[model samples]
Target: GLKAAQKTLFPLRSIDDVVRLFAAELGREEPDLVLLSLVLGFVEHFLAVNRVGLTYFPVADLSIIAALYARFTAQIRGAVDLSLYPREGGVSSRELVKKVSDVIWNSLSRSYFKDRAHIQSLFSFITGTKLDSSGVAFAVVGACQALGLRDVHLALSEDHAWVVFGPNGEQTAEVTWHGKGNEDRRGQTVNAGVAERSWLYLKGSYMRCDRKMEVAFMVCAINPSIDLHTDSLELLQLQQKLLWLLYDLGHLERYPMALGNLADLEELEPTPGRPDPLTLYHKGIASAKTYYRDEHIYPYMYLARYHCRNRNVREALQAWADTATVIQDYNYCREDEEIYKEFFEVANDVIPNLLKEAASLLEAGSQGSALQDPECFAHLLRFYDGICKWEEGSPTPVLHVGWATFLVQSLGRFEGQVRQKVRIVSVPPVLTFQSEKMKGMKELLVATKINSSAIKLQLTAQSQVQMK
Candidate 1:
């Protein structure tokens, strides 16, 4: 039987109104027992309907029977006191009714059907019917009028019920069945004043206003936890792969492969909680300095020897820029707090000195008496030795070797004709370095070698004598 006590049905309004009503009800000063009563009322109604099929019974009969049963049962069974509302005094009776309605709806919808079909049907049936000229029906229209709805057009589809107030279109309220079955009803809401235009409602879960807002909340709440579990895993993997690749590259004087990998890394978007790819590249540079410094100097020094080694210069310059960017980012160096101390040290201490030596050798080689000067060759060897020493314990040996080899070859090319005498006294150090550092450097070296070889072949062909 349905309980026909004097129950106030609060008029559904805009989302802002609903939120205001909710806040009022849940604030300090309201009696906690009020919420308990509302909950009990809903539970009793639900059980009565499910057991006695009140929906199928006549409305009058259902109300009479349910009321009698509730009175009797309450006395016999003794109600469980569940105090779950705020002790706030500012909440109006009307606001409390609305909040209680929301609570009941939340509980019943979540507990019984795991869906909203039944609730939708119930509300739809109540609001869909029209009234006589006096504008009153005992069930819906009269109730709506009593609840303070005037000139409101109530509508009910299969999945939702809405009220449009005033023919001129001033206000509206809608509730949707959002679970899974009805996609159309999931987010549909009546736009203010325009019946034809509908807006998709999100974050409608008594909690928030939109899906993205909910997601933003989740991001704030959960991202730290996620990072705690997943941080640095990618960085560690990349570090290991880089180390193995350098070692396998047999101490090659150049690392075209590593450079290519760095380029690939640079192309990826910076991921939160993961080391930036550019930062990784800088680390690779530092690692090369620590591990393959000797073999690595060849490329840099050799590039300085020949004027045609502009390509090597471009690549090295790019690497330097990339490394600088990484250091700047990681150290938060933008604010000028001496944050990039290490980067400054490397730039000021290592790079400038190395460039000076390379430039001097190249100038000597370019002077036409290069082959006559033993000091030029000795300087070249000493440069290679210095680089090898620099990279002795580093992880990016291939980068070291690649840069070193580029310098050596470039300088060696101009040794005799340009500045001072330079001779390849023995190929053992070069070969040994290649054997140790050129293992994983192959792919990069192969690409560079192919390109260089192609250019050389083209030049040779162009210079060939005519076969006429």
Candidate 2:
């Protein structure tokens, strides 16, 4: 934003807008090279921001302005422009900088953006030209420094760069070409004085985000104290959200490999009340949490594998089924996106595995081991009774997601929280991942259970033969 004074053309200065005329007032008085450079620099910045090009040279108006100031003093060169600055009578340098800074401050501060790309797109929309963060930042920083604004720091992080001045609190001149934006709420948008705070006012608005935001909003939305009632609207919403969560969680945490493996694998069950020893803070530092890259699949997909290992049929079924349900109609872009191809390759296999997991869970359940915890098993029975309500189309029953339920959830979209933490992420790929040499997840997994279930029941018309 420092250089925005350059990007933006000095506003509409029609015949009526003129209040000061340097040429008309200081006729015959010539400005030294130092003054000429300052004036030209300011002109260049204004033209750059306004997106105006300089095809030909024009020294008429400039010559007149240059003529106003006389004599260059001891000039300093290099990093900080040390050229001689002629004083305009008793007007102090600080006063002069403030004078020049005021008009350009708004220009530097003004921004219209949606996201990273939006930041690029918006400047062109505003300037009628390209938006160069480097040029803007450089220009802005240099201009500020040239005008004697001390303590200006060039802030560069990941895909962004800008300038910050003054104290950390208010009245700080934190200028940038890019800033985060969101209108969700006190907590949902960028935190207080956070960069993108001003972005909310931009045209695209910092209102919504992609998938990860969905999880934070969903996680906080469900009350852990309230018992999860499978039949109520609350549970239905939870079910939908849980599906979304599982879909995202696995893809997030170390991209938990594939699910519903029928391979000869040992079983493991999470101890009751200690399903996971990991509390929230601990879970935060877990191996995969930091990477949070698109595992190109759900992170919780491994949950299905875990349940299957324990022969916990219902849990595996829900996990597998959830994976299938979310991706079938999932197209944020609505059509031919390369991601569609990327996801579909891994997707078609999901539905079949869903049926496979449900069958394994049901088999394990009826045969008894699955019922080890009657209370937990009851949830699956409820799901079976409700979800399996359909008879023909689907061999395995799933989320009917009825008309009213769908409508209510969709209409209440704004009611749920928009997660701010998703935006809160481990930065760029460089050093975030805890590598072998680096300090990382120390909790070692020891196979706790190995319940073998070779029992595969092949259900066919009147054929009760379990696939031997």
Candidate 3:
């Protein structure tokens, strides 16, 4: 009896030969190996061609090539681990070919080869061929079709190559070789027919040793599109105006109302035939020349300052957290780590201690009693006034209204106690003071009687009662 042995195969004349040989070893019929060999051979050949192309290109121009190689390597590793046995005890070679092709297409599409030179070099290195020429454009179009990109144009320029898809040759994408100095040619659509022509031309011109090299050549031609859909100036202006309005409103200490306006701004969708969010975000950020510092970190810091003015401890902490997250995500803190560290320290230590002090005062009832003590109330009101005036502008309506209402209601509550201390009976009903300014203050307090009802409700809700 003959013993069955497993053997690893090496390089074959073509990918088809590998399939045939593998099938023969398994004792399968002739044509069974043919289809399997073709698919496997095609993938292997494509990868090799791309690798060779990258090696031939400059070392600096290998980012896209490296990405493509990495993707292909991952696919190969996955393919080898796949269970070849059919689920129903039968396998279809055609189905396997389709499956492998689909995998290859997906992997290659994600490489985004046109945008960088590194990828072109890696492709050349793997395939042992020069890929930075005009002929390769057509080959790329075929690969796009295989990857399901219809009506694609593989345009090449002085610096890059890209693909375009859609009727009337409007959509575009590209792949480039070297690093620069590429120019775009008109009427050169990167379609299946163009790809087939380029593949044939490349094989014949390069003296490629295997038929599988043609398939590989086609795959390597896949690149990103160059045509960028420009957003309308009107839409950009709207975005700018919205940003400014939101910023101004936030600065004015009108957060809740500003957030409502932000909702309204968000409702205005981008114009029809516009780019997707990722593209639009990139373009908008770039055109505005708005650094991450300006867009997020600074705005968040401003929000933190706003919260501090409102004495909102939790909201201030949240603003700090948002700022930190944005800085970390964009690596903005890397250049000035101390700035973030200082902010973190303040947020973690100083702010919390201040919050604790405020909480203690409230808990001890001093927060309410302080209003009755003239000296204490004067100091507290001065501190609040300083905060309100810090922005070097006229007093904001909300701040002025809230402060005036608080002062009047509080002084009125203590007026009776003051009269008892002075040993006065009746105390002129409302306790008129000597200074005319004090008279004005008392009149303001009289006006606040109407507003005090709302203030009383708010204070009562926020205050906690301790029962013995």
Candidate 4:
């Protein structure tokens, strides 16, 4: 179509011509633009040849895509020795890609690729001190291009790849992987494509006005710890620090700041109260970039979460004790009277299960089975202390370990019956700073849905366990 526009104007002969011109056009723009043209042209050419625009469904295997791009990009950057492409004896583009990708898929670090000087110099062509995505890219797809096989173009996103080859006629292959390996991966979108959105995300969709995202990421790349939680205008004032921050392969990495909507978010500062420790109380989970981990638990409560927002189980479990005291004294939120139990339920069922799981795992590990991790005992210590502390907290309750609640679910079409209903505080509350309360399980109303198909039974103490 571009050539049809003009023999004198857009003049072009083959897709190979486009790739060549694609390389030449970037000769002056900016070295990075070299990638932009090479990639975008790859997209345009594939869409033209396969007559298919990008689709996000079923999803292209991403690591596969990244290697694909690595190969093509490596080609445009330098030269290849076509003889290396074993797929080139004469085959379809798909077959060629498969042949090359399979070899790369398993054991990318091997002498097979190292034998090729260009490819290895490109990966180390697999690891070492200055390891990078280049070597992998070149060795993988580089094999295809050097052999003049598919003529595929590679598409890249925040940090991976996707291919667009089908004997790409003067066309492209698809692919990502950021320089440092931390770039966020693509998300799911049905008809929507991954690279398409990421391209806009990394480059900003529009020209002058939408470039803030690119700058935002670049700023983050320089200092991933940089916070966007302040004034916006002052940010641009510092944008030019970019003068020295070019993303030449030498300085490539994902943005230093949080990715996606995380950079766009900020906590609400309305509440006022021993200082509310505010964000720290809720596990500092206000940020989408972070989440409370199970290991943070100190007996179903968050040892790490409290440390972040604000204390844990007995307040003394050694390795993590004094830290507990500091929190219980300074960060402790005793407004509820039962801080330990309250925080225990902070994760409610999740915390209980995590505690139980840790206990079970350590129990099993002690018997000397496989799946051993040194941290299991470390976690068990905290779980036990958390339970012990719960025994000491507000509303001071009787204890029951291993059975937070009894559950007996049935499904069948026989003549047996069993019944049991557990009641939590009829006025049970989620026990958080917000007083998030709710009714416990709605007092057995019908008690059992009587799946109707199942054999039925009731509790009279005479009832014995049956499982036929």
Candidate 5:
């Protein structure tokens, strides 16, 4: 029976075999969401280790997948009573999702880290007692799929996830908790946070994932890191190949973070025929701009990291400036701690390191050193000014004495003439956005009005250079 099971699993001896299976799965009119996720989970957790050894065949066979699929389907079918919910015409969407969410939320191990790796698949849910937050949300959708609920789909913001269903996909419900002790919101409509402009909710621009897009979400969640300083090459290759397959299939057009993650992989081990890292980075930024109204920050930060790694100081400074502009659109909330750390690392660690490189260039009397570039200093000012404005109406403060200390030290590096080149002139107002037109107008007006004020304070304290 074990031999029969092993024989039944698909023979995944190489990357292309996995890609082939994924292509077939994704090509179906209704992709087997549960099967696709289980396949990925099996490869990531089981086949990854076995592939490295030369002792036996490295096929990720079909039998185990069939078994796990059966087990998961049975688990959901056993726990979730479809007869009780009765999937009525109007109440089917919300009621079904609420029931599914309840099954997942009530099944998790109490009081464990919700951010751990390898816990994001149905395989994890079937085999282990714990699942991460996103994993739980994913499980809800998968279980819904198994229950033959066609309308239910996962809804994902940058930092959080839930579900959306109904005939027109207009209905929404929270399937899992986000961040810390805020766990009471499950099985409820995902609103209020967006209304309050919380960064966690992404101002209602969250991705309403289709089946293929959900596959991309799983691919994006692939963790190659084996330890702190090391990674499994096999896992890394698997993820890279899968992302490229998704990219080739045009599934990444609206998914900016997936593009960013792909670009990060490209930067590390470039594929010969594919687009370079810089092109992928720009594509991600453009994708964000076109689809998400440039609200997402990771694409821009990925671009910033690319430029910074290549020692393009001026370019890196502009990318960081753009990142801050994107972040200023949202009000910081409690669940924004992850993004806060991103900003913190960029401001304190990345900027300081880049400046150190620029200072050395200046010492060598390099003609194009950013230390002598007035626009570089201007970009730096815009970068910090955007962050200050981000904190203007928010409950949480963004910058502190450490950020100020770095800004002061960074300013001291640029000459007085370079600093003086940055003029605080009045900017005309511009209006945009379809749903919330005046919100953009209000934020833009507030930003321009405070731009001069914050710049005046920073320049006065950092240097004796005259403000224009």
Candidate 6:
């Protein structure tokens, strides 16, 4: 005696029912991007613990989304003469896309917490009067979808996003601000950054997302935090459920970071009848390698964090080395501060502490530990070597005396046999697509030998002077 699962209705009353709405939308050949993104924003803000305590029922989710959608469409229509620039073969003109970008950019409040959580939605845009960079980009996509511009879609890299339009979606444009204190580069296509070979651009390896991927992107933005110290379990569960729904629909196959996010949730709370977090993490890494041309580093870092937590030192070291390898292709830039901080913490703190533990275990007569593995030593050297290469000709330097000192200290943990078994040599740098024609191609071609002990002496001397 079994009962079938109940179908949920829209105007979703609780966080639990949001996934039903999402599933219904995503099931469509062309899902309603505006509806999904706005509804996600609506529930996140409304279902928040603090916001709900005193209110019985504020508004239906669908009503708010409907009103906001109408308002947004009217605003766009008022500024852009859509009749003059009618869609041709479902592609929008660059001029029309830029006008929508202008609407989103100018409409944002002059000052608000730009980096606040839950601000990356239409709910925040309409009511709270704020929109972060991602929020603005999503809004532009939403506006395009509203205007029936099916070709206008979201393009994403690891840390930044923009819009892609035109037939074949070859054309690109930055619709929002990126990083801190940067100039407003809105309305211009992102060819300049991609041409620069900057890590922020990923050498033209960005994800030109479809509607399904955009839904994953929106779902990825769901933050379940109640405050600094608490998370609404219901919200978290909704996010996980929606992500899994997307996963089952084969939507996460090309979206590595979304897969990584899903792996993170499954890591925190293992789900029944699903692959564990480790398997999901590997799938994310593989997804980046296969579809994204191995440009993403977060997938490897996510796996490294998981391995580190489980005391799998050798695997963790290998994952970090792979992460460094992925980053080795790009020149560091001012816009690359976020990844710089990630590598900084890994090199100076995480790996060192990891080695400290491995060293203690070895000192306590543990057999066959990571400290005794020659390849582990090699992974450590390759890790630092990639960082050094990342700083080789870039205007912004990535390594300093502290980084060099950490490398030397980490090297001291290995024995002569282990150290000598792993050899480093100067190798010709492998060029990636779109970077072969970069401006400083010749200067970037000068390759440095990555011998670790040699780097210890060379980097130590240079960084001492650098510090002075």
Number of the top-ranking candidate, with lDDT as the measure: 6
For candidate 1, what is the TM-score? 0.19
lDDT of 1 by residue, 75-164 (tens): 222321123323233221223223322322333322343322122221222222211111111112212222333333333221223433
Higher-scoring candidate on TM-score, 1 or 5:
5
For each candidate in turn, the TM-score is 0.19, 0.21, 0.18, 0.24, 0.87, 0.87
Please give the CA lDDT of all the candidate structures.
Answer: 0.29, 0.29, 0.34, 0.29, 0.75, 0.78
Worst 10 residues of 1 by lDDT: 217-226
**For model 1, what is the alpha-carbon lDDT of residue 306?**
25
List pairs with backbone clashes in candidate 6.
none
Per-residue C-alpha lDDT of model 2 across residues 44-153, encoded as one tens digit per residue? 33333222454432222433333322211111112223244334332223333333333233343345333322122222222332334433433343444444444333
Ranking by TM-score: 6, 5, 4, 2, 1, 3
- Of the candidates numbered 1 and 5, which has the greater lDDT value? 5
Predicted candidate 5 versus true structure: per-residue lDDT over 1-468, tens digit per residue: 113422332667666777777777777676677887777777777544334554332466676677888887776888888888876774355767887888887777776777777788877777776788888888888888777787888888888888888868888888887887664687688788888787788888788898888889988887776667877677788889989988998999989989989999988899999999889999988988888877888888889988998999999998998898888778887778888998888878888888987888778788978888877876776676677667767887776555655665666667766665554443431112211211222222222123333433442323344559
Better of 1 and 2 by TM-score: 2
Greater TM-score among 1 and 3 belongs to 1
334: Cα error in model 6, Å: 3.0
lDDT of 4: 0.29
In terms of TM-score, how similar is model 6 to the real structure? 0.87
> In candidate 4, how many Å is residue 380 off?
26
